[PDB]
Design an enzyme around this catalytic site. Structure first.
Site, mmCIF file in Angstrom:
data_model
loop_
_atom_site.group_PDB
_atom_site.id
_atom_site.type_symbol
_atom_site.label_atom_id
_atom_site.label_comp_id
_atom_site.label_asym_id
_atom_site.label_seq_id
_atom_site.Cartn_x
_atom_site.Cartn_y
_atom_site.Cartn_z
ATOM 1 N N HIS A 86 0.834 -1.218 0.000
ATOM 2 C CA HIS A 86 0.000 0.000 0.000
ATOM 3 C C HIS A 86 0.865 1.262 0.000
ATOM 4 N N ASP A 116 5.924 21.968 -26.434
ATOM 5 C CA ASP A 116 6.215 20.642 -25.886
ATOM 6 C C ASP A 116 7.362 20.772 -24.873
ATOM 7 N N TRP A 156 7.192 0.897 4.129
ATOM 8 C CA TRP A 156 7.506 1.537 2.845
ATOM 9 C C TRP A 156 8.893 2.200 2.887
ATOM 10 N N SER A 184 12.564 7.685 -13.382
ATOM 11 C CA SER A 184 11.389 8.331 -13.981
ATOM 12 C C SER A 184 11.179 9.757 -13.472
ATOM 13 N N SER A 185 11.206 9.928 -12.155
ATOM 14 C CA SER A 185 11.023 11.233 -11.549
ATOM 15 C C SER A 185 12.136 12.190 -11.929
ATOM 16 N N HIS A 268 11.467 13.420 3.954
ATOM 17 C CA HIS A 268 10.714 14.622 4.101
ATOM 18 C C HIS A 268 10.410 15.357 2.768
ATOM 19 N N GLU A 270 10.118 14.262 -0.119
ATOM 20 C CA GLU A 270 9.116 13.409 -0.737
ATOM 21 C C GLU A 270 7.667 13.876 -0.467
ATOM 22 N N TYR A 272 6.578 16.847 0.340
ATOM 23 C CA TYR A 272 6.370 18.154 -0.295
ATOM 24 C C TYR A 272 6.342 18.006 -1.816
ATOM 25 N N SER A 283 -4.858 26.681 -6.174
ATOM 26 C CA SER A 283 -4.815 28.102 -6.539
ATOM 27 C C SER A 283 -5.596 28.439 -7.810
ATOM 28 N N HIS A 317 12.810 14.923 12.430
ATOM 29 C CA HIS A 317 11.527 14.824 13.161
ATOM 30 C C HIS A 317 10.839 13.458 12.932
ATOM 31 N N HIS A 318 11.343 12.688 11.979
ATOM 32 C CA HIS A 318 10.880 11.320 11.763
ATOM 33 C C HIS A 318 11.678 10.313 12.625
ATOM 34 N N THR A 343 3.723 27.381 5.373
ATOM 35 C CA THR A 343 2.811 26.311 4.972
ATOM 36 C C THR A 343 1.398 26.634 5.404
ATOM 37 N N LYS A 346 -0.528 29.809 3.717
ATOM 38 C CA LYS A 346 -1.197 29.645 2.410
ATOM 39 C C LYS A 346 -2.694 29.368 2.524
ATOM 40 N N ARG A 465 1.356 1.463 15.072
ATOM 41 C CA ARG A 465 1.348 1.259 13.623
ATOM 42 C C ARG A 465 1.806 -0.141 13.287
HETATM 43 C C1 HEA Z 1 1.464 16.920 2.612
HETATM 44 C C2 HEA Z 1 2.548 16.410 3.191
HETATM 45 C C3 HEA Z 1 2.807 16.759 4.648
HETATM 46 C C4 HEA Z 1 2.738 17.986 5.222
HETATM 47 C C5 HEA Z 1 2.400 19.350 4.581
HETATM 48 C C6 HEA Z 1 3.045 17.842 6.622
HETATM 49 C C7 HEA Z 1 3.061 18.867 7.544
HETATM 50 C C8 HEA Z 1 3.627 18.892 8.799
HETATM 51 N N1 HEA Z 1 4.161 17.777 9.426
HETATM 52 FE FE1 HEA Z 1 3.748 15.779 8.731
HETATM 53 N N2 HEA Z 1 4.132 13.998 7.838
HETATM 54 C C9 HEA Z 1 3.824 13.568 6.554
HETATM 55 C C10 HEA Z 1 3.352 14.410 5.545
HETATM 56 C C11 HEA Z 1 3.179 15.789 5.668
HETATM 57 N N3 HEA Z 1 3.303 16.504 6.833
HETATM 58 C C12 HEA Z 1 4.084 12.131 6.467
HETATM 59 C C13 HEA Z 1 3.860 11.231 5.210
HETATM 60 C C14 HEA Z 1 4.544 11.706 7.659
HETATM 61 C C15 HEA Z 1 4.953 10.279 8.133
HETATM 62 C C16 HEA Z 1 5.355 9.220 7.098
HETATM 63 C C17 HEA Z 1 5.536 7.821 7.719
HETATM 64 O O1 HEA Z 1 6.053 7.688 8.854
HETATM 65 O O2 HEA Z 1 5.175 6.816 7.079
HETATM 66 C C18 HEA Z 1 4.590 12.860 8.534
HETATM 67 C C19 HEA Z 1 5.015 12.802 9.852
HETATM 68 C C20 HEA Z 1 5.363 13.877 10.643
HETATM 69 C C21 HEA Z 1 6.190 13.869 11.842
HETATM 70 C C22 HEA Z 1 6.840 12.636 12.477
HETATM 71 C C23 HEA Z 1 5.743 11.926 13.292
HETATM 72 C C24 HEA Z 1 6.192 10.566 13.806
HETATM 73 O O3 HEA Z 1 6.453 9.637 12.988
HETATM 74 O O4 HEA Z 1 6.266 10.401 15.057
HETATM 75 C C25 HEA Z 1 6.249 15.136 12.294
HETATM 76 C C26 HEA Z 1 6.989 15.649 13.481
HETATM 77 O O5 HEA Z 1 7.400 16.800 13.469
HETATM 78 C C27 HEA Z 1 5.480 15.989 11.421
HETATM 79 C C28 HEA Z 1 5.295 17.356 11.550
HETATM 80 C C29 HEA Z 1 4.654 18.192 10.651
HETATM 81 C C30 HEA Z 1 4.377 19.621 10.800
HETATM 82 C C31 HEA Z 1 4.728 20.522 12.006
HETATM 83 C C32 HEA Z 1 3.757 20.043 9.696
HETATM 84 C C33 HEA Z 1 3.407 21.545 9.416
HETATM 85 O O6 HEA Z 1 4.198 22.020 8.330
HETATM 86 C C34 HEA Z 1 1.937 21.779 9.053
HETATM 87 C C35 HEA Z 1 1.643 23.285 8.911
HETATM 88 C C36 HEA Z 1 0.439 23.575 9.769
HETATM 89 C C37 HEA Z 1 -0.782 23.703 9.245
HETATM 90 C C38 HEA Z 1 -1.020 23.578 7.773
HETATM 91 C C39 HEA Z 1 -1.926 23.965 10.184
HETATM 92 C C40 HEA Z 1 -2.859 25.061 9.665
HETATM 93 C C41 HEA Z 1 -2.222 26.391 10.018
HETATM 94 C C42 HEA Z 1 -2.831 27.570 9.817
HETATM 95 C C43 HEA Z 1 -4.208 27.619 9.212
HETATM 96 C C44 HEA Z 1 -2.131 28.857 10.195
HETATM 97 C C45 HEA Z 1 -0.709 28.644 10.736
HETATM 98 C C46 HEA Z 1 -0.771 28.506 12.246
HETATM 99 C C47 HEA Z 1 0.252 28.043 12.997
HETATM 100 C C48 HEA Z 1 1.560 27.615 12.390
HETATM 101 C C49 HEA Z 1 0.080 27.959 14.483
HETATM 102 N N4 HEA Z 1 4.975 15.180 10.434
HETATM 103 C C1 HEA Z 2 -0.889 9.348 -0.960
HETATM 104 C C2 HEA Z 2 -0.645 8.395 -0.058
HETATM 105 C C3 HEA Z 2 -1.726 7.480 0.561
HETATM 106 C C4 HEA Z 2 -3.025 7.328 0.257
HETATM 107 C C5 HEA Z 2 -3.830 8.076 -0.829
HETATM 108 C C6 HEA Z 2 -3.577 6.343 1.180
HETATM 109 C C7 HEA Z 2 -4.872 5.893 1.207
HETATM 110 C C8 HEA Z 2 -5.404 5.118 2.201
HETATM 111 N N1 HEA Z 2 -4.721 4.590 3.281
HETATM 112 FE FE1 HEA Z 2 -2.793 4.695 3.582
HETATM 113 N N2 HEA Z 2 -0.866 4.871 3.990
HETATM 114 C C9 HEA Z 2 0.083 5.548 3.236
HETATM 115 C C10 HEA Z 2 -0.181 6.434 2.220
HETATM 116 C C11 HEA Z 2 -1.433 6.584 1.659
HETATM 117 N N3 HEA Z 2 -2.578 5.887 2.027
HETATM 118 C C12 HEA Z 2 1.409 5.214 3.712
HETATM 119 C C13 HEA Z 2 2.714 5.788 3.101
HETATM 120 C C14 HEA Z 2 1.282 4.355 4.727
HETATM 121 C C15 HEA Z 2 2.418 3.699 5.557
HETATM 122 C C16 HEA Z 2 2.675 2.249 5.141
HETATM 123 C C17 HEA Z 2 3.671 1.638 6.118
HETATM 124 O O1 HEA Z 2 3.299 1.407 7.288
HETATM 125 O O2 HEA Z 2 4.841 1.389 5.760
HETATM 126 C C18 HEA Z 2 -0.131 4.135 4.924
HETATM 127 C C19 HEA Z 2 -0.656 3.339 5.900
HETATM 128 C C20 HEA Z 2 -2.000 3.152 6.076
HETATM 129 C C21 HEA Z 2 -2.601 2.514 7.236
HETATM 130 C C22 HEA Z 2 -1.849 1.980 8.472
HETATM 131 C C23 HEA Z 2 -1.250 0.601 8.229
HETATM 132 C C24 HEA Z 2 -0.568 0.071 9.485
HETATM 133 O O3 HEA Z 2 0.045 0.850 10.261
HETATM 134 O O4 HEA Z 2 -0.648 -1.161 9.714
HETATM 135 C C25 HEA Z 2 -3.918 2.470 7.035
HETATM 136 C C26 HEA Z 2 -4.922 1.905 8.017
HETATM 137 O O5 HEA Z 2 -6.129 1.891 7.830
HETATM 138 C C27 HEA Z 2 -4.179 3.091 5.743
HETATM 139 C C28 HEA Z 2 -5.416 3.249 5.187
HETATM 140 C C29 HEA Z 2 -5.662 3.939 4.042
HETATM 141 C C30 HEA Z 2 -6.963 4.057 3.423
HETATM 142 C C31 HEA Z 2 -8.267 3.426 3.980
HETATM 143 C C32 HEA Z 2 -6.789 4.773 2.318
HETATM 144 C C33 HEA Z 2 -7.826 5.175 1.263
HETATM 145 O O6 HEA Z 2 -8.658 4.057 0.995
HETATM 146 C C34 HEA Z 2 -8.624 6.415 1.732
HETATM 147 C C35 HEA Z 2 -9.844 6.629 0.820
HETATM 148 C C36 HEA Z 2 -9.356 7.292 -0.455
HETATM 149 C C37 HEA Z 2 -9.784 7.029 -1.702
HETATM 150 C C38 HEA Z 2 -10.849 6.003 -2.004
HETATM 151 C C39 HEA Z 2 -9.190 7.865 -2.818
HETATM 152 C C40 HEA Z 2 -8.148 7.125 -3.656
HETATM 153 C C41 HEA Z 2 -7.684 7.966 -4.829
HETATM 154 C C42 HEA Z 2 -6.425 7.910 -5.295
HETATM 155 C C43 HEA Z 2 -5.422 6.995 -4.627
HETATM 156 C C44 HEA Z 2 -6.025 8.767 -6.499
HETATM 157 C C45 HEA Z 2 -5.695 7.859 -7.699
HETATM 158 C C46 HEA Z 2 -5.196 8.611 -8.949
HETATM 159 C C47 HEA Z 2 -6.035 9.117 -9.909
HETATM 160 C C48 HEA Z 2 -7.526 9.015 -9.808
HETATM 161 C C49 HEA Z 2 -5.519 9.818 -11.140
HETATM 162 N N4 HEA Z 2 -2.993 3.507 5.157
HETATM 163 CU CU LIG Z 3 8.957 15.146 7.578
#
Ligand code: HEA
Ligand code: HEA
Ligand SMILES: [Cu+]
Ligand SMILES: CCCCCCCCCCO[C@@H]1O[C@H](CO)[C@@H](O[C@H]2O[C@H](CO)[C@@H](O)[C@H](O)[C@H]2O)[C@H](O)[C@H]1O
Ligand SMILES: CCCCCCCCCCO[C@@H]1O[C@H](CO)[C@@H](O[C@H]2O[C@H](CO)[C@@H](O)[C@H](O)[C@H]2O)[C@H](O)[C@H]1O
Ligand SMILES: CCCCCCCCCCO[C@@H]1O[C@H](CO)[C@@H](O[C@H]2O[C@H](CO)[C@@H](O)[C@H](O)[C@H]2O)[C@H](O)[C@H]1O
Ligand SMILES: CCCCCCCCCCO[C@@H]1O[C@H](CO)[C@@H](O[C@H]2O[C@H](CO)[C@@H](O)[C@H](O)[C@H]2O)[C@H](O)[C@H]1O
Ligand SMILES: CCCCCCCCCCO[C@@H]1O[C@H](CO)[C@@H](O[C@H]2O[C@H](CO)[C@@H](O)[C@H](O)[C@H]2O)[C@H](O)[C@H]1O
Ligand SMILES: CCCCCCCCCCO[C@@H]1O[C@H](CO)[C@@H](O[C@H]2O[C@H](CO)[C@@H](O)[C@H](O)[C@H]2O)[C@H](O)[C@H]1O
Ligand SMILES: CCCCCCCCCCCCC
Ligand SMILES: CCCCCCCCCCCCC
Ligand SMILES: CCCCCCCCCCCCC
Ligand SMILES: CCCCCCCCCCCCC
Ligand SMILES: CCCCCCCCCCCCC
Ligand SMILES: CCCCCCCCCCCCC
Ligand SMILES: [Ca+2]
Ligand SMILES: [Cu+]
Ligand SMILES: [Cu+]
Ligand SMILES: [Mg+2]
Lengths: 535, 256
Positions: A86, A116, A156, A184-185, A268, A270, A272, A283, A317-318, A343, A346, A465
Site C-alpha cells: 500500500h 512541448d 515503505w 522516472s522522476s 521529508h 518526498e 512536499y 490556486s 523529526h521522523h 505552509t 497559504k 502502527r
Molecule cells: C502533505 C505532506 C505533509 C505535510 C504538509 C506535513 C506537515 C507537517 N508535518 Fe507531517 N508527515 C507527513 C506528511 C506531511 N506533513 C508524512 C507522510 C509523515 C509520516 C510518514 C511515515 O512515517 O510513514 C509525517 C510525519 C510527521 C512527523 C513525524 C511523526 C512521527 O512519525 O512520530 C512530524 C513531526 O514533526 C510531522 C510534523 C509536521 C508539521 C509541524 C507540519 C506543518 O508544516 C503543518 C503546517 C500547519 C498547518 C497547515 C496547520 C494550519 C495552520 C494555519 C491555518 C495557520 C498557521 C498557524 C500556525 C503555524 C500555528 N509530520
Molecule cells: C498518498 C498516499 C496514501 C493514500 C492516498 C492512502 C490511502 C489510504 N490509506 Fe494509507 N498509507 C500511506 C499512504 C497513503 N494511504 C502510507 C505511506 C502508509 C504507511 C505504510 C507503512 O506502514 O509502511 C499508509 C498506511 C495506512 C494505514 C496503516 C497501516 C498500518 O500501520 O498497519 C492504514 C490503516 O487503515 C491506511 C489506510 C488507508 C486508506 C483506507 C486509504 C484510502 O482508501 C482512503 C480513501 C481514499 C480514496 C478512495 C481515494 C483514492 C484515490 C487515489 C489513490 C487517487 C488515484 C489517482 C487518480 C484518480 C488519477 N494507510
Molecule cells: Cu517530515
C-alpha cells in the site's frame, strides 16, 4: 491504437500517467479495503496461515471471507506485506505520477506557452521507467520473501536490519522498483526545469508564470536533490543484502540509524514533492470559482520556494525516538516549527482569495474547499507531532497515521480530484455530469473523515502502527474507521463510473473556456481538446 | 494490583498518567489541543462564512483585491507568536524527558524477534518476557480457551490478551528507574504509554530513558517499531509495587 505508448507529446504522456496512476491507485486502495476488513474487529479472521495451503488463486479467494478465530492461524507476514505494498504504491507509483507526471506534463507547457517539453523522447522514457518500476514493485509481492512466504514485510521506508535480513529476493525487486521510480522522476524533473527555463512564450516573464507551473518547477528541483539521495540509501541496502557490505550492520561496524538519516533526507522532501502540485491546482481552481484573482501571487510563489528549501533541513523529526541527542531533537523541532509558518499561511491566502468573490460551488471548487479543511486538520496535528516531548507518546501510533492521511494522503487526493473535474472537459472534449461530481465529493468527504478522524483516538489510546491485530479495547474506533474506508471505496468505484460515463457519453464540450473569464491561463484560450501541436 | 496502563473501550484520550513525565505530556498536549481546535474551528467557520456571504447569488460582482497589509502582518506574526508560546512550554518538558537522572533502579532491556529480555545488573537478575499466547507459552498468537486460562492464572483476564506477558518487569513505586534499551537482531521499540516513555531498541546502540512511577499497579506497552512477523505480538508488562514487595520479588530470584 497502441501508438499511444510510443507518443512523445507532453499531452499524450500526461494522459498516460493519469490513467496509470489511477489504475495503480485502484490497486493500492483495494489493499486498504482488505486492511480495513482485517482491522474492523479484534482477532484475526482474514489473514489466516491456512490460506497458504491452497493455490495462489484459491488462497486469494478464501482470504476475502472471514473465518472463526479457532480456524484462523494469524499470519502477520501478509499484514506487513500488504501495508508495505500500500505505502510503496502510493508514495512512488500513484500520486506523484498523477500530479507531476500527469497534470504536470499535460498542463505546465500549456501554462507557460511552450509547444512541448525540451526533450520529448526522454519524457516518453520517463513514462516507461514508471511502468517498469510499478511492474517490479507488484512482482515483489509474488516473489519469495520473508518468513518463507512471498513479498516483503518491511514498511515503505525499508528500515534495516529488518529490510537487509528479509529472506528471498522480493526485497531486491522492491529496491529495483524504487530505483526505476527515482529515474522516472529525475527525467521528468530535468524536462520540467529545462522547459520552464528555456521554452516560455515571448512576454511570458517569471512573474507572469501561473502558480501551477511554479508548483511543478519547485517540485522538479526537490526531486533532483532528494531522489539521488534515496538512490544511495537503497543501493547501500542492496549491497548489505547481496555484496558483503555492512553499512547498516553493527557486526561490521555499521549503524542502522545511518540509514534513517539518509532515507529521511529524501523522505521529508518526498511529502512536499507530493503536495506542491496540489497547491498549484488549488490556486487555479479557487481563483476560477471565486471569480477573483489569487490573493498574494508573489507570496504564494515565495512560500512554495521557502517550503521547498526548508523541507531539506527537518528530516530528523521522523527520528525523535531513534536515539537522537537532546541538541539534535531541539534543533529539528525548531526547524520544523519554522516551516509550519509559510505552509499554514497559504490557507489564509486561499480563504482571502474567496473573500469578496462571487462564488460558484461546482465540483472542482468543492474538492478545493475540502482540501482546505482536511489540510488544516492534518497540519495542526503536525504541530503537535513537531513537539518531540509529545511525539514520544505519539510516534509509531495511529495518531501519526491520522496526521499524514489528513495532510498528505487526502491533500494529494483532493488535489487530484480537483484537477480531474477542472480539466476533464479540456483534456477529453467531454464534460462530467455535475450532480455525480457532487455526489462523489460528499461520499468521499464523509467517508474520509469517518476513516481517519477516529484514528487520532486510537493513537491517543496507544495503538501502534503496523499491527495485524490489536487489544479488544481498540475495537470501537477501528470499526468506525473501517466503515469509513468501505464508504470511501464505494465513492471511488462511483468515481470510476463517472469517468467511464464522461469519456464515453458525457456532454460534448463546445467552448475553449467552459468555465468563466477568471480561468485566465493559456489552456482556456485553446480548443477542447487542444490542437495536436499547440503554440 | 490494579490494571492502570491500558487502553479502555471506546477511549479518545490518553492512557492514565503514572509518572510526572506522562503528566507533563498530558498537560502540553491539552494546551496544544485547545489552540489547534481554535485554529481549526476558526479556519472552518471562515470558509463556511465566505461561501455563504460571497456566494454568486448573494455577491454578484466579485472584488479584485490581492493585498491587505495589516491583515498579512497580523496573519504572519500571530502564527509565529503561537509557536513561540508552545516552544516555551515544550522545550523544558523535552529537557526533563531526555536528561537522564541518577538511577535508583537500573534495568537493561533487549528487544528480540519476538520477545523482550530484561537484565537487572545490580541484582544479577535476568529473564525473558513473552506474550501470553505466543508460541513460547504454547499458543499461536490468538485467543483460545488455553490462552484465557493462562491469562487468569497469571493474574489477568481475557481482556488483557495481546498486552499481558508471562513475566513482568517489576519495579518499586516512587523510585527513579533508568532503562537501557538495545536491540539484538532488528530494531524494536520499548514503550509504556502510562509512563510517557518510548525508545527504539537499535542493534549496536544502547540508549537510555527514565521514569518514576507515582502509583502501584500494572502498565502495558507494545513493540513500537515494525520488526517482522510478530511485531503485534511482543508486548511489555511493568508491575509497579511497594519497596517491600519489590525486595520480596528480588529475593525470590536469589540463588543460594
Ligand atoms: C502533505 C505532506 C505533509 C505535510 C504538509 C506535513 C506537515 C507537517 N508535518 Fe507531517 N508527515 C507527513 C506528511 C506531511 N506533513 C508524512 C507522510 C509523515 C509520516 C510518514 C511515515 O512515517 O510513514 C509525517 C510525519 C510527521 C512527523 C513525524 C511523526 C512521527 O512519525 O512520530 C512530524 C513531526 O514533526 C510531522 C510534523 C509536521 C508539521 C509541524 C507540519 C506543518 O508544516 C503543518 C503546517 C500547519 C498547518 C497547515 C496547520 C494550519 C495552520 C494555519 C491555518 C495557520 C498557521 C498557524 C500556525 C503555524 C500555528 N509530520
Ligand atoms: C498518498 C498516499 C496514501 C493514500 C492516498 C492512502 C490511502 C489510504 N490509506 Fe494509507 N498509507 C500511506 C499512504 C497513503 N494511504 C502510507 C505511506 C502508509 C504507511 C505504510 C507503512 O506502514 O509502511 C499508509 C498506511 C495506512 C494505514 C496503516 C497501516 C498500518 O500501520 O498497519 C492504514 C490503516 O487503515 C491506511 C489506510 C488507508 C486508506 C483506507 C486509504 C484510502 O482508501 C482512503 C480513501 C481514499 C480514496 C478512495 C481515494 C483514492 C484515490 C487515489 C489513490 C487517487 C488515484 C489517482 C487518480 C484518480 C488519477 N494507510
Ligand atoms: Cu517530515
Ligand atoms: C463497497 C464496499 C465493500 C467493502 C467490503 C466490506 C466487507 C465487510 C466484511 C464484514 O464481515 C464481517 O467480518 C467480521 C470479522 O471482522 C465478522 O465478525 C464476527 O466473526 C468473527 C469470526 O469470523 C469473530 O471473531 C468476530 O468477533 C465477530 O464479530 C462478521 O461476522 C462479518 O460479518
Ligand atoms: C482514472 C483517471 C482518469 C483521468 C481522466 C483523464 C481524462 C483525459 C482523457 C483524454 O483523452 C483524449 O481524448 C481525445 C478525444 O476524446 C483525444 O483526441 C486525445 O488524444 C486524448 O488525449
Ligand atoms: C458502487 C458505488 C455506488 C454509489 C451509489 C450510486 C447512487 C446513485 C444515485 C442515482 O440517482 C440519480 O440521482 C440524480 C440526482 O437527482 C439524478 O439526476 C437527475 O437530477 C439532477 C438534479 O440535480 C439533474 O441535474 C439531472 O439532470 C437529472 O438526471 C439521476 O437521474 C438519478 O439516477
Ligand atoms: C459503478 C457505477 C456507478 C454509476 C456511475 C454513473 C455516473 C454517471 C451518471 C450520469 O447520469 C446522467 O446524468 C445526466 C446529466 O445530468 C442525465 O441527463 C439528463 O439531464 C440532462 C440535462 O438536463 C438532459 O438534457 C438529459 O436529456 C437528461 O437525460 C442522465 O439522464 C443521467 O443518466
Ligand atoms: C487570518 C484570517 C484571514 C482569513 C482571510 C479572510 C479575510 C480577507 C479580508 C479582506 O479584507 C478586505 O481587503 C481589501 C483590500 O485590502 C479592502 O479593500 C479596500 O482596498 C481596496 C484596494 O486594494 C479597495 O478597492 C476597496 O474599495 C477598499 O475597501 C477591504 O476593505 C477589506 O474588507
Ligand atoms: O535553552 C535551554 O532551556 C532549557 C529549559 O527549557 C534549560 O534547561 C534547564 O531547565 C529545565 C527546566 O525543566 C531543566 O529540565 C534542565 O535541567 C535545566 O538545564 C537549558 O539550561 C537552556 O540551555
Ligand atoms: C458469518 C459470515 C458473515 C459473512 C460476511 C462476509 C463478508 C464479505 C466480504 C466480501 C467483500 C469483498 C471485497
Ligand atoms: C450550490 C449549493 C450547494 C449546497 C451548499 C453546499 C455547501 C458547500 C460547503 C463545502 C465545504 C466543505 C468543507
Ligand atoms: C454519505 C454521503 C452523503 C450524500 C450527500 C449527497 C448530496 C447530493 C449531491
Ligand atoms: C465522539 C466524536 C465522534 C467523531 C466521529 C468521527 C468523525
Ligand atoms: C483538530 C484535530 C484534533 C485531533 C485530536 C482529537 C482528540 C480529541 C480527544 C480528546 C479527549 C480527551 C479526554
Ligand atoms: C522558547 C523557544 C521557542 C522557539 C520556537 C521556534 C519558532
Ligand atoms: Ca480482525
Ligand atoms: Cu519487536
Ligand atoms: Cu515490533
Ligand atoms: Mg519508529
Amino acid at each position: 491504437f497502441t501508438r499511444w505508448f510510443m507518443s512523445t507529446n507532453h499531452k499524450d504522456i500526461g494522459v498516460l500517467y493519469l490513467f496509470t496512476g489511477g489504475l495503480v491507485g485502484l490497486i493500492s486502495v483495494a489493499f486498504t479495503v482488505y486492511m480495513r476488513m482485517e482491522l474492523m474487529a479484534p482477532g484475526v479472521q482474514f489473514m489466516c496461515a491456512e490460506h497458504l495451503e491452497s493455490g495462489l488463486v484459491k488462497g486469494f479467494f478464501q482470504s476475502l471471507w472471514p473465518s472463526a478465530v479457532e480456524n484462523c492461524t494469524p499470519n502477520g507476514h501478509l499484514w506487513n506485506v500488504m501495508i508495505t505494498g500500500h505505502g510503496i504504491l502510493m508514495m512512488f507509483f500513484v500520486v506523484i505520477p498523477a500530479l507531476f507526471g500527469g497534470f504536470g506534463n499535460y498542463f505546465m507547457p500549456l501554462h507557460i506557452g511552450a509547444p512541448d517539453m525540451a526533450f520529448p523522447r526522454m519524457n516518453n522514457l520517463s513514462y516507461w521507467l514508471y511502468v517498469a518500476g510499478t511492474s517490479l514493485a507488484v512482482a515483489s509481492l509474488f516473489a519469495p520473501g520473508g518468513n518463507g512466504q512471498l513479498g516483503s514485510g518491511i514498511g515503505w521506508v525499508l528500515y534495516p536490519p529488518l529490510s537487509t535480513s528479509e529472506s528471498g529476493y522480493s526485497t531486491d525487486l522492491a529496491i529495483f522498483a524504487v530505483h526505476l521510480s527515482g529515474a522516472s522522476s529525475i527525467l521528468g524533473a530535468i524536462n520540467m526545469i529545462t522547459t520552464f527555463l528555456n521554452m516560455r512564450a515571448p512576454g511570458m516573464t517569471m512573474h507572469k508564470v501561473p502558480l501551477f507551473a511554479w508548483s511543478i518547477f519547485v517540485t522538479a528541483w526537490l526531486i533532483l536533490l532528494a531522489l539521488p539521495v534515496l538512490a544511495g540509501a537503497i543501493t547501500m541496502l542492496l549491497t548489505d543484502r547481496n555484496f558483503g557490505t555492512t553499512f547498516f550492520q553493527p557486526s561490521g561496524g555499521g549503524d542502522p540509524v545511518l540509514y534513517q538519516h539518509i532515507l529521511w533526507f529524501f523522505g521529508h522532501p518526498e511529502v512536499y514533492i507530493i503536495v506542491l502540485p496540489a497547491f498549484g491546482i488549488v490556486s487555479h481552481v479557487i481563483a476560477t470559482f471565486a471569480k477573483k484573482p489569487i490573493f498574494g501571487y508573489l507570496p504564494m510563489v515565495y512560500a512554495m520556494v521557502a517550503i521547498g528549501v526548508l523541507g531539506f533541513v527537518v528530516w530528523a523529526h521522523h527520528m525523535y525516538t531513534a536515539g537522537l541527542s537532546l541538541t539534535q531533537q531541539s534543533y529539528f523541532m525548531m526547524a520544523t516549527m519554522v516551516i509550519a509558518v509559510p505552509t499554514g499561511i497559504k490557507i489564509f491566502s486561499w480563504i482571502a482569495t474567496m473573500w469578496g468573490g462571487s462564488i460558484e460551488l461546482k465540483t472542482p471548487m468543492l474538492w478545493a474547499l475540502g482540501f482546505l479543511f482536511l489540510f488544516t486538520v492534518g497540519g495542526v496535528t503536525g504541530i503537535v507531532l513537531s513537539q518531540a516531548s509529545v511525539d514520544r507518546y505519539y510516534h509509531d501510533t495511529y495518531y501519526v497515521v491520522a496526521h499524514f492521511h489528513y495532510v498528505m494522503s487526502l491533500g494529494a487526493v483532493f488535489g487530484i480530484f480537483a484537477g480531474i473535474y477542472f480539466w476533464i472537459g479540456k483534456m477529453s472534449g467531454r464534460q462530467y455530469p455535475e450532480w455525480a461530481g457532487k455526489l462523489h465529493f460528499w461520499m468521499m468527504f464523509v467517508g474520509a473523515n469517518l476513516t481517519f478522524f477516529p484514528q487520532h483516538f486510537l493513537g491517543r489510546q496507544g495503538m501502534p502502527r503496523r499491527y495485524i491485530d490489536y487489544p479488544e479495547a481498540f475495537a470501537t474506533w477501528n470499526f468506525v474507521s473501517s466503515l469509513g474506508a468501505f464508504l470511501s471505496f464505494a465513492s471511488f468505484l462511483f468515481f470510476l463510473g463517472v469517468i467511464f460515463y464522461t469519456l464515453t457519453r458525457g456532454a460534448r464540450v463546445t467552448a475553449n473556456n467552459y468555465w468563466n473569464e477568471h480561468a485566465d491561463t493559456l489552456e482556456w484560450t485553446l480548443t477542447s481538446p487542444p490542437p495536436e501541436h499547440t503554440f | 494490583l490494579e490494571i492502570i496502563g491500558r487502553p479502555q473501550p471506546g477511549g479518545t484520550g490518553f492512557q492514565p498518567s503514572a509518572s510526572p513525565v506522562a503528566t507533563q505530556i498530558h498537560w502540553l498536549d491539552g494546551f496544544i489541543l485547545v489552540i489547534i481546535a481554535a485554529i481549526t474551528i476558526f479556519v472552518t467557520l471562515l470558509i463556511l462564512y465566505a461561501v455563504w456571504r460571497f456566494h454568486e447569488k448573494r455577491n454578484k460582482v466579485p472584488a479584485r483585491f490581492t493585498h491587505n497589509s495589516p491583515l498579512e502582518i497580523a496573519w504572519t506574526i500571530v502564527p509565529i507568536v503561537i509557536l513561540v508560546a508552545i516552544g516555551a512550554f515544550s522545550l523544558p518538558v523535552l529537557f526533563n524527558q531526555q536528561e537522564i537522572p541518577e538511577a535508583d533502579v537500573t534495568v537493561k532491556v533487549t528487544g528480540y524477534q519476538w520477545y523482550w529480555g530484561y537484565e537487572y545488573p545490580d541484582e544479577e537478575i535476568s529473564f525473558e518476557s513473552y506474550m501470553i499466547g505466543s508460541p513460547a507459552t504454547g499458543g499461536d498468537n490468538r485467543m483460545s480457551p488455553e490462552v484465557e486460562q493462562q491469562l487468569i492464572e497469571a493474574g489477568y483476564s481475557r481482556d488483557e490478551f495481546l498486552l499481558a506477558t508471562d513475566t513482568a518487569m517489576v519495579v518499586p513505586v516512587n523510585k527513579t528507574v533508568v532503562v537501557q534499551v538495545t536491540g539484538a537482531d532488528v530494531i524494536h521499540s520499548w514503550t509504556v504509554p502510562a509512563f510517557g516513555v518510548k525508545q527504539d531498541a537499535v542493534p549496536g546502540r544502547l540508549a537510555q530513558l527514565w521514569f518514576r512511577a507515582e502509583r502501584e499497579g500494572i502498565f502495558f506497552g507494545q513493540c513500537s517499531e515494525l520488526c517482522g512477523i510478530s511485531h503485534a505480538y511482543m508486548p511489555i508488562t511493568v508491575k509497579v509495587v511497594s519497596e517491600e514487595a519489590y525486595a520480596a520479588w528480588l529475593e525470590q530470584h536469589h540463588h543460594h
